[PDB]
């Protein structure tokens, strides 16, 4: 609310003007590129909104209530983007993400995001095309030359 | 838009215009100024000027 | 490992680690794909004879 | 230190408080989770800064 003051200090009418300030909005997309044995999740709003920072948490089996995530699931971390190399991630099983946008003021809900890593085994094994030599063979495959 | 003047004794006119908004967004989301062009005009003699 | 600010800066922290050990594992994703064409010169005259 | 001023500028006893500003604390603990060739170090700290 605005009010012009004389010079003699009396008041005038007011005027007034409404703004909201708003928590970040949740992300809409989720990008996931498959890896060797990592997944990569980079998460995009519609708005710039250049304030925003991501906060990922990562869970094994699928929650079935949004505000069990917080407690059940564990906090990998806040970035930009985030990457998820460890032995435990496998090719063969699923895994599941949860990510929410935080800033200063306020925090977004939840969002799932599924992902797998890569399965191209004859991609990567392409890199190996002829450097396996007798040395790379094991004890109970040896014993198959001297036979 | 055009409008008439019918008032008999007025010595100057004043014209209140402006634009809604100005931000030109980019496709990564910046944001940069634009420019925008008016004519005032008043039908004097018989053309408008 | 130390940690710093605009203000100033800590002392240093020292850790000791390693890459995975665990050959089993990674050597499972490749558990049937292996052919002769994976397979060296040395091993290929083994073929032959 | 804080001191009141009448109108007429006349100055009151003082009252005061210290404050200090400080480094940060070194890193409690590391985390190193092995991976395929690479080591990944992900530091923290007692409270939160």
Known sequence: ??????????????????????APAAPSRIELTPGYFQITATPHLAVYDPTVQFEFWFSEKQIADIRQVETS?????????????????????????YIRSVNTVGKSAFVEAVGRASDDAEGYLDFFKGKITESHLGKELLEKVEL | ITRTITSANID????????????ETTSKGDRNPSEVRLLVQIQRNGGWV
């Open chain 1, 1 to 22: 609310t605005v009010r012009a003051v004389n010079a003699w200090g009396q008041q005038g009418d007011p005027a007034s003007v409404s703004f909201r300030i708003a």
């Open chain 1, 73 to 97: 699931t564990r906090y990998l971390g806040t970035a930009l983007y985030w990457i998820a190399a460890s032995i435990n991630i496998k090719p063969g099983h699923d895994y599941y993400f």
């Open chain 2, 12 to 23: 100057r006119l004043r014209f209140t215009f402006g634009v809604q908004a100005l931000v």
